[PDB]
Design an enzyme around this catalytic site. Structure first.
Site, PDB file in Angstrom:
ATOM      1  N   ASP A 195       2.173   5.330  -1.130  1.00  0.00           N
ATOM      2  CA  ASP A 195       3.291   5.535  -0.216  1.00  0.00           C
ATOM      3  C   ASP A 195       4.501   6.272  -0.772  1.00  0.00           C
ATOM      4  O   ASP A 195       5.266   5.701  -1.550  1.00  0.00           O
ATOM      5  CB  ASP A 195       3.727   4.156   0.273  1.00  0.00           C
ATOM      6  CG  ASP A 195       4.820   4.213   1.307  1.00  0.00           C
ATOM      7  OD1 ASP A 195       5.436   3.158   1.543  1.00  0.00           O
ATOM      8  OD2 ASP A 195       5.054   5.290   1.888  1.00  0.00           O
ATOM      9  N   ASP A 202       6.395  11.403   4.216  1.00  0.00           N
ATOM     10  CA  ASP A 202       5.953  10.028   4.018  1.00  0.00           C
ATOM     11  C   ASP A 202       4.454   9.815   4.220  1.00  0.00           C
ATOM     12  O   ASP A 202       3.982   9.726   5.351  1.00  0.00           O
ATOM     13  CB  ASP A 202       6.738   9.121   4.972  1.00  0.00           C
ATOM     14  CG  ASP A 202       6.499   7.651   4.718  1.00  0.00           C
ATOM     15  OD1 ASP A 202       5.732   7.315   3.792  1.00  0.00           O
ATOM     16  OD2 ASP A 202       7.089   6.829   5.452  1.00  0.00           O
TER      17      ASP A 202
END
Length: 325
Positions: A35, A218
């Site tokens: 992430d 992201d």
């Protein structure tokens, strides 16, 4: 695989991508979600009282390199999910690169969403300015300081389920077979701890649906989340209808749709027609783009699975190019 190379698994219809990471001595393999939107490395542990029975749990007792820490941690992600526990120290093997003494976060409690998910935890690739605990050095921080990578970068390829899925992260380098043409350099704004960039404009056909706007790259977010106005403008171009929950319903037939094109630092990058549809449930298709009450966009997997990205934490900057397919 090569040194620093981590093969990824595409979960479901491009929902998320996770890779195996070995932690401890002799160590266990854990499936972690990579992430770039966060910076904490946390994993389920045998101290957890509400974790999933399917998750692989880190056991301090089974690692000869475990070192206790007296600090606690708590994190809350945007999607409402959370987790908390205590800090610890142990070795982390990332694609053959053995990071010694990495601060890891063992969960004692985690949200049901994680307990039912496919991963054992998260590997944060954001900047260290947003670690939940002050003084914690991220895996990338350590890869650099321990000399495990010569260039402060990692190449990212996220595959599409329709093409067989997969994906691959390479720490300390990148793979040109995964993209086509020349890489375009884009400066990064890390003032908020994320990989922020500026999109000059967005067009659909001949219509300019949006002028310049900021966003963060992201990998930990499934959709392309856009600010209210921008999202509505894009939606109107495709005839999608607001579901009222941040998502849009769109025609399942993308054969007639033109790609959503982003102009970034003078080059064109797109979200292909097939990517405009995220999921199909009982004849109803949910769009690959959504909306949030933010002033900036969250450029998630919908975009990333169409564009190869080289993240450079040193400058910082990113190099982007259309994926080869």
């Amino acid at each position: 695989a090569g040194v620093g190379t981590v093969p990824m698994t595409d979960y479901g219809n491009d929902i998320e991508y996770y890779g195996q990471v070995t932690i401890g001595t002799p160590g266990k393999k854990f499936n972690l979600d990579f992430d770039t939107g966060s910076s904490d490395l946390w994993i389920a542990s045998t101290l957890c009282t509400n974790c999933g029975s399917r998750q692989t749990k880190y056991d301090p007792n089974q690692s000869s390199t475990y070192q206790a820490d007296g600090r606690t941690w708590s994190i809350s992600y945007g999607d409402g999910s959370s987790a908390s526990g205590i800090l610890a120290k142990d070795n982390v093997n990332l694609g053959g690169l053995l990071i010694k003494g990495q601060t890891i976060e063992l969960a004692k409690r985690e949200a049901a969403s994680f307990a039912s998910g496919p991963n054992d935890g998260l590997l944060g690739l954001g900047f260290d300015t947003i670690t939940t605990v002050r003084g914690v050095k991220t895996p990338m921080d350590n890869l650099i300081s321990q000399g495990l990578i010569s260039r402060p970068i990692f190449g990212v390829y996220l595959g599409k389920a329709k093409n067989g899925g997969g994906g691959e992260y390479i720490f300390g380098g990148y793979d040109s077979t995964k993209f086509k043409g020349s890489l375009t350099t884009v400066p990064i704004d890390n003032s908020r701890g994320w990989w922020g960039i500026t999109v000059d404009r967005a067009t659909v056909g001949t219509s300019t649906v949006a002028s310049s706007f900021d966003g963060i790259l992201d990998t930990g977010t499934t959709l392309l989340i856009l600010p209210n106005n921008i999202a509505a403008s894009v939606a109107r171009a495709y005839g999608a209808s607001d579901n009222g929950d941040g998502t849009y319903t769109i025609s399942c037939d993308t054969s007639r749709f033109k790609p959503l094109v982003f102009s970034i630092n003078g080059a064109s990058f797109q979200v292909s027609p097939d990517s405009l549809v995220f999921e199909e449930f009982q004849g109803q298709c949910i769009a690959g783009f959504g909306y949030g009450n933010w002033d900036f966009a969250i450029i998630g997997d919908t975009f990333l699975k169409n564009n190869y990205v080289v993240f450079n934490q040193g400058v910082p900057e990113v190099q982007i190019a259309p994926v080869a397919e």
